Amino acid sequence: DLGKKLLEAAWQGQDDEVRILMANGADVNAQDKFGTTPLHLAADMGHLEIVEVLLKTGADVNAAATGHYFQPYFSHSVSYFGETPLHLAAEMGHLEIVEVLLKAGADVNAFADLGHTPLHLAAQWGHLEIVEVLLKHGADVNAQDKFGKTPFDLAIDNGNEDIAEVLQKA
Protein backbone atom coordinates (compact mmCIF):
# COMPACT_ATOMS: atom_id res chain seq x y z
CA ASP A 1 0.00 0.00 0.00
CA LEU A 2 1.59 3.20 -1.27
CA GLY A 3 -0.22 5.53 1.14
CA LYS A 4 1.03 3.63 4.16
CA LYS A 5 4.53 3.57 2.67
CA LEU A 6 4.37 7.33 2.02
CA LEU A 7 3.25 8.06 5.59
CA GLU A 8 6.11 5.92 6.88
CA ALA A 9 8.69 7.56 4.60
CA ALA A 10 7.68 11.11 5.58
CA TRP A 11 7.77 10.11 9.26
CA GLN A 12 11.22 8.58 8.82
CA GLY A 13 12.60 11.48 6.81
CA GLN A 14 13.35 9.30 3.80
CA ASP A 15 13.48 12.02 1.11
CA ASP A 16 14.29 9.85 -1.90
CA GLU A 17 11.64 7.30 -0.95
CA VAL A 18 9.06 10.08 -0.65
CA ARG A 19 9.82 11.22 -4.20
CA ILE A 20 9.75 7.69 -5.60
CA LEU A 21 6.51 6.72 -3.87
CA MET A 22 4.69 9.77 -5.19
CA ALA A 23 6.01 9.15 -8.70
CA ASN A 24 4.48 5.68 -8.41
CA GLY A 25 1.18 7.34 -7.54
CA ALA A 26 1.13 7.39 -3.74
CA ASP A 27 -1.63 9.64 -2.40
CA VAL A 28 0.01 12.84 -1.08
CA ASN A 29 -2.98 13.20 1.26
CA ALA A 30 -2.93 9.64 2.58
CA GLN A 31 -4.24 9.30 6.14
CA ASP A 32 -3.34 6.96 8.95
CA LYS A 33 -5.91 5.59 11.40
CA PHE A 34 -6.39 8.97 13.05
CA GLY A 35 -6.36 11.27 10.02
CA THR A 36 -2.66 12.11 10.23
CA THR A 37 -1.10 12.88 6.83
CA PRO A 38 2.44 12.77 5.40
CA LEU A 39 2.64 16.56 5.80
CA HIS A 40 1.76 16.23 9.51
CA LEU A 41 4.44 13.61 10.01
CA ALA A 42 7.21 15.52 8.21
CA ALA A 43 6.27 18.78 9.96
CA ASP A 44 6.39 17.18 13.41
CA MET A 45 9.70 15.42 12.83
CA GLY A 46 11.42 18.45 11.33
CA HIS A 47 11.86 17.23 7.77
CA LEU A 48 11.83 20.54 5.90
CA GLU A 49 12.64 19.26 2.43
CA ILE A 50 9.86 16.68 2.61
CA VAL A 51 7.37 19.30 3.82
CA GLU A 52 8.32 21.37 0.78
CA VAL A 53 7.97 18.53 -1.74
CA LEU A 54 4.66 17.40 -0.24
CA LEU A 55 3.27 20.91 -0.55
CA LYS A 56 4.54 21.18 -4.11
CA THR A 57 2.77 17.91 -4.97
CA GLY A 58 -0.59 19.00 -3.62
CA ALA A 59 -0.57 18.20 0.10
CA ASP A 60 -3.50 19.75 1.98
CA VAL A 61 -1.90 22.41 4.21
CA ASN A 62 -5.10 22.53 6.29
CA ALA A 63 -5.48 18.81 7.01
CA ALA A 64 -6.75 18.24 10.55
CA ALA A 65 -6.23 14.94 12.37
CA THR A 66 -9.23 13.47 14.20
CA GLY A 67 -10.04 14.93 17.61
CA HIS A 68 -8.72 13.15 20.69
CA TYR A 69 -8.86 15.05 23.96
CA PHE A 70 -11.53 16.98 25.85
CA GLN A 71 -9.48 17.87 28.93
CA PRO A 72 -5.89 19.15 29.30
CA TYR A 73 -3.55 16.78 27.45
CA PHE A 74 -0.10 18.39 27.16
CA SER A 75 2.77 15.90 27.32
CA HIS A 76 5.71 14.57 25.32
CA SER A 77 3.60 11.59 24.25
CA VAL A 78 0.98 13.36 22.14
CA SER A 79 0.47 11.89 18.63
CA TYR A 80 -2.90 13.23 17.49
CA PHE A 81 -5.14 15.99 18.82
CA GLY A 82 -7.45 17.41 16.17
CA GLU A 83 -4.55 19.40 14.79
CA THR A 84 -3.05 20.72 11.52
CA PRO A 85 0.59 20.38 10.39
CA LEU A 86 1.19 23.95 11.60
CA HIS A 87 0.21 22.90 15.14
CA LEU A 88 2.87 20.21 15.02
CA ALA A 89 5.58 22.45 13.57
CA ALA A 90 4.81 25.10 16.22
CA GLU A 91 4.69 22.46 18.96
CA MET A 92 8.06 21.00 18.01
CA GLY A 93 9.87 24.29 17.41
CA HIS A 94 10.55 23.91 13.68
CA LEU A 95 10.78 27.54 12.61
CA GLU A 96 11.64 27.00 8.96
CA ILE A 97 8.68 24.61 8.61
CA VAL A 98 6.29 27.04 10.33
CA GLU A 99 7.26 29.69 7.77
CA VAL A 100 6.81 27.33 4.82
CA LEU A 101 3.39 26.23 6.05
CA LEU A 102 2.27 29.83 6.57
CA LYS A 103 3.51 30.73 3.08
CA ALA A 104 1.43 27.84 1.73
CA GLY A 105 -1.64 29.35 3.37
CA ALA A 106 -2.00 27.64 6.77
CA ASP A 107 -4.53 29.25 9.11
CA VAL A 108 -2.29 30.85 11.75
CA ASN A 109 -5.18 30.43 14.21
CA ALA A 110 -6.33 26.93 13.35
CA PHE A 111 -8.01 25.28 16.33
CA ALA A 112 -6.94 21.88 17.66
CA ASP A 113 -8.42 19.96 20.58
CA LEU A 114 -9.57 22.33 23.35
CA GLY A 115 -9.40 25.11 20.78
CA HIS A 116 -5.62 25.37 21.00
CA THR A 117 -4.00 27.52 18.32
CA PRO A 118 -0.43 27.18 17.07
CA LEU A 119 0.36 30.12 19.37
CA HIS A 120 -0.94 28.18 22.43
CA LEU A 121 1.37 25.32 21.47
CA ALA A 122 4.44 27.47 20.85
CA ALA A 123 3.92 29.23 24.19
CA GLN A 124 3.37 25.96 26.04
CA TRP A 125 6.59 24.40 24.75
CA GLY A 126 8.83 27.45 25.03
CA HIS A 127 9.46 28.38 21.41
CA LEU A 128 10.01 32.12 21.57
CA GLU A 129 11.10 32.65 17.98
CA ILE A 130 8.06 30.76 16.70
CA VAL A 131 5.81 32.82 19.00
CA GLU A 132 7.23 35.95 17.34
CA VAL A 133 6.67 34.64 13.80
CA LEU A 134 3.08 33.62 14.62
CA LEU A 135 2.27 37.04 16.09
CA LYS A 136 3.76 38.70 13.01
CA HIS A 137 1.42 36.58 10.86
CA GLY A 138 -1.71 37.54 12.77
CA ALA A 139 -1.91 34.99 15.60
CA ASP A 140 -4.71 35.91 18.03
CA VAL A 141 -2.97 36.73 21.32
CA ASN A 142 -6.29 36.60 23.19
CA ALA A 143 -7.38 33.16 21.97
CA GLN A 144 -9.03 31.25 24.84
CA ASP A 145 -9.16 27.47 25.01
CA LYS A 146 -12.11 25.38 26.27
CA PHE A 147 -11.18 26.24 29.83
CA GLY A 148 -10.45 29.89 29.22
CA LYS A 149 -6.65 29.65 28.93
CA THR A 150 -4.79 32.02 26.62
CA PRO A 151 -1.27 31.40 25.26
CA PHE A 152 -0.06 33.83 27.94
CA ASP A 153 -1.57 31.62 30.65
CA LEU A 154 0.12 28.53 29.25
CA ALA A 155 3.47 30.34 29.09
CA ILE A 156 3.15 31.43 32.73
CA ASP A 157 2.02 27.95 33.82
CA ASN A 158 5.02 26.22 32.17
CA GLY A 159 7.65 28.70 33.34
CA ASN A 160 8.18 30.43 29.99
CA GLU A 161 8.53 33.97 31.31
CA ASP A 162 10.28 35.32 28.22
CA ILE A 163 7.30 34.32 26.10
CA ALA A 164 4.82 35.59 28.72
CA GLU A 165 6.42 39.05 28.55
CA VAL A 166 6.24 39.11 24.74
CA LEU A 167 2.58 38.03 24.75
CA GLN A 168 1.60 40.39 27.56
CA LYS A 169 2.59 43.49 25.58
CA ALA A 170 1.10 42.16 22.35
Add this chain to the structure above:
Amino acid sequence: DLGKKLLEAAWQGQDDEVRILMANGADVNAQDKFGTTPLHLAADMGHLEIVEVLLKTGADVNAAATGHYFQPYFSHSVSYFGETPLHLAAEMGHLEIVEVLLKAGADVNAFADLGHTPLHLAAQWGHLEIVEVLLKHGADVNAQDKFGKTPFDLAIDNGNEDIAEVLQKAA
Protein backbone atom coordinates in the same frame (compact mmCIF):
# COMPACT_ATOMS: atom_id res chain seq x y z
CA ASP B 1 8.66 18.84 38.66
CA LEU B 2 12.20 18.81 37.27
CA GLY B 3 12.23 15.27 35.93
CA LYS B 4 9.15 15.91 33.84
CA LYS B 5 10.71 19.12 32.51
CA LEU B 6 13.89 17.22 31.66
CA LEU B 7 11.90 14.62 29.71
CA GLU B 8 10.19 17.44 27.81
CA ALA B 9 13.45 19.26 27.05
CA ALA B 10 14.99 16.04 25.74
CA TRP B 11 11.91 15.42 23.57
CA GLN B 12 12.12 19.00 22.25
CA GLY B 13 15.87 19.02 21.60
CA GLN B 14 16.26 21.98 23.94
CA ASP B 15 20.00 21.69 24.71
CA ASP B 16 20.24 24.76 26.93
CA GLU B 17 17.18 23.84 28.98
CA VAL B 18 18.61 20.33 29.42
CA ARG B 19 21.80 21.98 30.76
CA ILE B 20 19.89 24.27 33.13
CA LEU B 21 17.54 21.58 34.46
CA MET B 22 20.40 19.22 35.23
CA ALA B 23 22.34 21.95 37.06
CA ASN B 24 19.23 22.50 39.17
CA GLY B 25 19.29 18.80 40.06
CA ALA B 26 16.99 17.13 37.51
CA ASP B 27 17.28 13.34 37.64
CA VAL B 28 18.98 12.10 34.46
CA ASN B 29 17.13 8.83 35.05
CA ALA B 30 13.67 10.32 35.49
CA GLN B 31 10.87 8.15 34.08
CA ASP B 32 7.42 8.94 32.77
CA LYS B 33 4.56 6.57 33.62
CA PHE B 34 5.53 4.17 30.81
CA GLY B 35 9.17 4.06 31.90
CA THR B 36 10.42 6.44 29.21
CA THR B 37 13.64 8.28 30.18
CA PRO B 38 15.25 11.45 28.81
CA LEU B 39 17.72 9.20 26.97
CA HIS B 40 14.85 7.36 25.21
CA LEU B 41 13.39 10.66 24.04
CA ALA B 42 16.65 12.23 22.87
CA ALA B 43 17.59 9.01 21.06
CA ASP B 44 14.13 8.73 19.47
CA MET B 45 13.99 12.36 18.37
CA GLY B 46 17.54 12.45 17.02
CA HIS B 47 19.17 14.84 19.45
CA LEU B 48 22.77 13.65 19.48
CA GLU B 49 24.34 16.24 21.76
CA ILE B 50 21.63 15.69 24.37
CA VAL B 51 22.19 11.93 24.13
CA GLU B 52 25.91 12.51 24.68
CA VAL B 53 25.46 14.74 27.74
CA LEU B 54 22.89 12.39 29.31
CA LEU B 55 25.29 9.44 28.93
CA LYS B 56 28.18 11.47 30.35
CA THR B 57 26.14 12.37 33.44
CA GLY B 58 25.00 8.84 34.26
CA ALA B 59 21.96 7.94 32.15
CA ASP B 60 21.21 4.21 32.08
CA VAL B 61 21.93 3.18 28.49
CA ASN B 62 19.74 0.05 28.73
CA ALA B 63 16.66 1.54 30.39
CA ALA B 64 13.54 -0.32 29.22
CA ALA B 65 10.18 1.37 28.60
CA THR B 66 6.91 0.82 26.77
CA GLY B 67 6.51 4.41 25.72
CA HIS B 68 4.27 6.49 23.52
CA TYR B 69 6.32 8.28 20.88
CA PHE B 70 5.12 10.36 17.94
CA GLN B 71 4.23 7.95 15.14
CA PRO B 72 1.63 7.13 12.50
CA TYR B 73 -0.93 4.48 13.47
CA PHE B 74 -2.40 1.65 11.44
CA SER B 75 -4.98 -1.03 12.20
CA HIS B 76 -3.77 -4.59 12.86
CA SER B 77 -0.35 -3.46 14.02
CA VAL B 78 1.74 -5.56 16.36
CA SER B 79 3.44 -4.08 19.40
CA TYR B 80 6.51 -4.69 21.52
CA PHE B 81 7.35 -3.80 25.09
CA GLY B 82 10.46 -2.77 26.99
CA GLU B 83 12.34 -0.97 24.23
CA THR B 84 15.69 0.66 25.00
CA PRO B 85 17.12 3.88 23.54
CA LEU B 86 19.07 1.80 21.01
CA HIS B 87 15.82 0.26 19.69
CA LEU B 88 14.50 3.77 19.15
CA ALA B 89 17.62 5.19 17.52
CA ALA B 90 17.87 2.16 15.22
CA GLU B 91 14.19 2.41 14.33
CA MET B 92 14.40 6.11 13.51
CA GLY B 93 17.66 5.79 11.59
CA HIS B 94 19.90 7.89 13.82
CA LEU B 95 23.32 6.45 12.97
CA GLU B 96 25.49 8.78 15.03
CA ILE B 97 23.28 8.14 18.04
CA VAL B 98 23.41 4.35 17.49
CA GLU B 99 27.21 4.58 17.53
CA VAL B 100 27.30 6.63 20.73
CA LEU B 101 24.87 4.27 22.47
CA LEU B 102 26.91 1.22 21.45
CA LYS B 103 30.11 2.86 22.68
CA ALA B 104 28.34 3.56 25.98
CA GLY B 105 27.61 -0.16 26.39
CA ALA B 106 24.10 -0.58 24.94
CA ASP B 107 22.94 -4.20 24.84
CA VAL B 108 22.60 -5.44 21.27
CA ASN B 109 20.79 -8.76 21.66
CA ALA B 110 19.22 -9.35 25.09
CA PHE B 111 15.90 -7.58 25.83
CA ALA B 112 12.80 -7.71 28.04
CA ASP B 113 10.68 -8.57 24.99
CA LEU B 114 12.80 -11.55 23.93
CA GLY B 115 14.29 -11.53 20.46
CA HIS B 116 12.94 -8.08 19.59
CA THR B 117 16.24 -6.39 18.73
CA PRO B 118 17.51 -3.07 17.32
CA LEU B 119 18.65 -5.09 14.27
CA HIS B 120 15.01 -6.09 13.64
CA LEU B 121 13.95 -2.44 13.64
CA ALA B 122 16.80 -1.20 11.45
CA ALA B 123 16.03 -3.93 8.91
CA GLN B 124 12.29 -3.26 9.10
CA TRP B 125 12.64 0.47 8.58
CA GLY B 126 15.32 0.33 5.89
CA HIS B 127 18.40 1.68 7.65
CA LEU B 128 21.26 -0.17 5.94
CA GLU B 129 24.20 1.67 7.51
CA ILE B 130 22.76 0.93 10.95
CA VAL B 131 22.19 -2.72 10.06
CA GLU B 132 25.89 -2.94 9.17
CA VAL B 133 27.05 -1.25 12.38
CA LEU B 134 24.87 -3.54 14.48
CA LEU B 135 26.25 -6.63 12.73
CA LYS B 136 29.78 -5.36 13.41
CA HIS B 137 28.87 -5.17 17.10
CA GLY B 138 27.73 -8.78 17.26
CA ALA B 139 24.01 -8.49 16.53
CA ASP B 140 22.46 -11.94 16.21
CA VAL B 141 21.18 -12.22 12.62
CA ASN B 142 19.05 -15.25 13.50
CA ALA B 143 17.27 -13.77 16.52
CA GLN B 144 13.53 -14.43 16.35
CA ASP B 145 10.98 -12.18 18.07
CA LYS B 146 7.72 -13.32 19.68
CA PHE B 147 6.07 -13.47 16.25
CA GLY B 148 8.81 -15.72 14.89
CA LYS B 149 10.28 -12.91 12.78
CA THR B 150 13.99 -12.52 12.05
CA PRO B 151 15.56 -9.29 10.79
CA PHE B 152 15.79 -10.92 7.34
CA ASP B 153 12.03 -11.52 7.47
CA LEU B 154 11.26 -7.93 8.38
CA ALA B 155 13.55 -6.68 5.60
CA ILE B 156 11.76 -8.86 3.03
CA ASP B 157 8.32 -7.99 4.45
CA ASN B 158 9.08 -4.31 3.94
CA GLY B 159 10.73 -4.47 0.52
CA ASN B 160 14.24 -3.74 1.75
CA GLU B 161 16.09 -6.10 -0.57
CA ASP B 162 19.55 -4.55 -0.13
CA ILE B 163 19.34 -5.16 3.62
CA ALA B 164 17.80 -8.61 3.11
CA GLU B 165 20.80 -9.60 0.98
CA VAL B 166 23.27 -8.33 3.59
CA LEU B 167 21.47 -10.29 6.32
CA GLN B 168 21.25 -13.48 4.27
CA LYS B 169 24.99 -13.37 3.51
CA ALA B 170 25.75 -12.82 7.19
CA ALA B 171 23.58 -15.75 8.27
